[PDB]
RNA sequence: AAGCUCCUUCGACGAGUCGAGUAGUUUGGGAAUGCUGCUCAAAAUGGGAGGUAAAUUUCUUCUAAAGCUAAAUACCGGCCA
RNA sequence: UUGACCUCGGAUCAGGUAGGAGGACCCGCUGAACUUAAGCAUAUCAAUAAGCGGAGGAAAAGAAACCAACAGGGAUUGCC
């Protein structure tokens, strides 16, 4: 029987982040309105100011 | 190649004749103790391992159990009558088996046994 | 066969029974002294397998040594440290062999089997009069026990070329310049 | 290579070091029953009863360190579960 | 959804990149480079050599992986690289040689980890029936599905497979865009550089009948045995010369 | 042993549709060259020519891929404000930069 | 010590993108900063590295936020200019 | 009391030890060369090390975590010559 | 009320034993720098010197979880 290449609720990669930003520091984007890019190539805007 | 202290680790063989005399006197000490007996034990004929040296034979450690049995010499008696025994070696070949049983038959033919006490 | 049952039970260490016994026993050892005489082996199968006999002359002493490191790593083992301390306390006995009995998070507990070389039973019995002979003084201090052999690397093969037959001896032999009479 | 006549050698007990001892297997089973399970074995049993067999294999590997050891541990624990179900 | 893919048609492909016991540090660095380039694939540590090779098909089922990249090291010197589709697909065994890793400082190129690569294949990959089966196995492994959530959005590197000898040469380049003179592409090599000699293609996951066998493969162990035999032959020639000269001297 | 029928049967069983009439290049992103690198490598020991042939093959593939992907509307160029993890670390890039610096410095120092 | 501009050192792609580099010895197109918003963002960055270290977390956050707002307004105005010149 | 022989009967072999990850140290030796510390922690047609592209992990060779043992070896110290 | 067992104690109890010296050689632990070379750093000196512990006339090692791939060898030690 064939395998379904699917992630189960125990895999380290079940819940994948949206930021598409790796293990780099967030010292970048400090002076930018956005934080990273998504899958489709659209940047992720910072929510608001506290 | 003298980056280390060879001067404190250097050795000279000025006692080569002295050690030769000492070893010869040791062989005579063994033959004074084992006077009618040979000063060594009968060792088997073994073929050298690798392809480089497999065309020649040498003396091995001891005779195998089943080649002693084929020669007709009991296990518990062979080391007593002066035959080295090697329980680790396997014959693996009728050629080695036959060579060693022939050697043991020659030893049997040339041996003299004294009757206990 | 009770010793075989205990062997399997001791292999099953994190099992419930063994874990319970090790806990309440670790508390006892923490309440007792750091080095103390153990009236009997806590692991009789391990003791008899390592050579403990129920004669007059075989003593068992239990010791706890602090675990961890000095980032420097000590070349000998906590077993070696425990054996050396037990021998120094019982300077008149010969350390036969030691074994782990309990671990704990800050200490580590070993029972050391020792033999009296001066007791008549030991002197008359073979299999132990070798340890009566004087070449076996302070085996734990010279690395002649099981942990000492393991740490010094007394195994045969290609993975122990430098360390078998003595590391310092091998280095000295390789670093001697040999000059013969007729060169 | 060279042509030498092969000889059939006797069986070696050192080769018979492979354990077929029925009494030793009996002792292992009895000690398993008496002593019980380690906490990670309890976790594996829990996952096997709930059918998370893949997760159980993964956890057994993480605890033991090798595919083969994990497989043997899971087989032993599945046998324990089957025997318990038969006994109850 | 459980695929980690957002696309109209989902190419659900996952890889288990696995290492054997006797793998050296250079082979481990290669495995790390390939695993970093593969976001749909996860690492697996040393695999017992006494285990059966189809046990790799039950390791794949555990991690829900349909593709396996198996690094098998022999004598601690030679890498054999296996590609398969579990549980019933084709498998290919290759001998990997000439390894250079991303930590080598002559490379000069770098790329986004997880970015989807443009896969370049030589023409022989659509001519010889054996090289077409290798192609689909390469596309499934070094492909990086369209909507995978662990991928990067912008594409900046090309992975090229070429057939120069009876071997597959694998290269990896960064696409550097430079403005035209009144933008065009330059390529800068970035990563692993290895050569793969095909050995067998067998109809099965790691078994079944063989569909292709090289019949022209020379083993490093064959080379070593030839050298040893040459040394033994020199010694035997010297011994034979000594015997013949002694006989002639007796005559 | 070259079982072409069996090779093709196995190929059919694992072949995902790549036909451009129904499948997009954004979906597959594989380019097959229209010429052999064999015909461009006369001698395999010539490292320069071999690497040039490999680079040219990859370059043709990259050009066609960029054309097709820009046609299909997939983002291609990496924005200057997109900072993300690399397959090679900043430390490794620093060492490559430093060896380039020392090589150029040695050459210009010999000139001086 | 010799400058990396003097030495013909290629640009290297890191977490900071190289971008579309310009050919050497050719016309590097001059982009002009004459907009009030572009002057604002350059000025905000300059004042940021001039002021430097601040003990107060909220003050640091506000400095970063004013730089971010300058970039946002610049992007909005440039997009508006793009739309204006594309439609009318 | 002992050796051998035969067999419609039996044949027990060392666990916080292997091993996995990791830090330090060491080696010609990341299949980690050995060792130690920390975390996890085994098996029974088992385990360890090698051979091998040969089509599957076949073959070869040994039994670790208990112990004893003279000789060939070293020697600026001891009793002398 | 008494008596066993277990555990832990006292005694100038009866009988023994260890400490220190020596350390040329031996078994462990610990552990440098001067020196040499190299853009730099690892490396080298050296797993040495110094320091600590433990034996003997020798010590240590030692009867394969060895070496091999042969027609195989067969505990350890030392020389070429």
Curated annotation (Swiss-Prot), chain A:
It is found in: Nucleus, Nucleolus; Nucleus, Nucleoplasm. Disulfide bonds: none annotated. Belongs to the WD repeat BOP1/ERB1 family. Component of the NOP7 complex, which is required for maturation of the 25S and 5.8S ribosomal RNAs and formation of the 60S ribosome. Component of the NOP7 complex, composed of ERB1, NOP7 and YTM1. The complex is held together by ERB1, which interacts with NOP7 via its N-terminal domain and with YTM1 via a high-affinity interaction between the seven-bladed beta-propeller domains of the 2 proteins. The NOP7 complex associates with the 66S pre-ribosome. This is Ribosome biogenesis protein ERB1. The gene is ERB1.
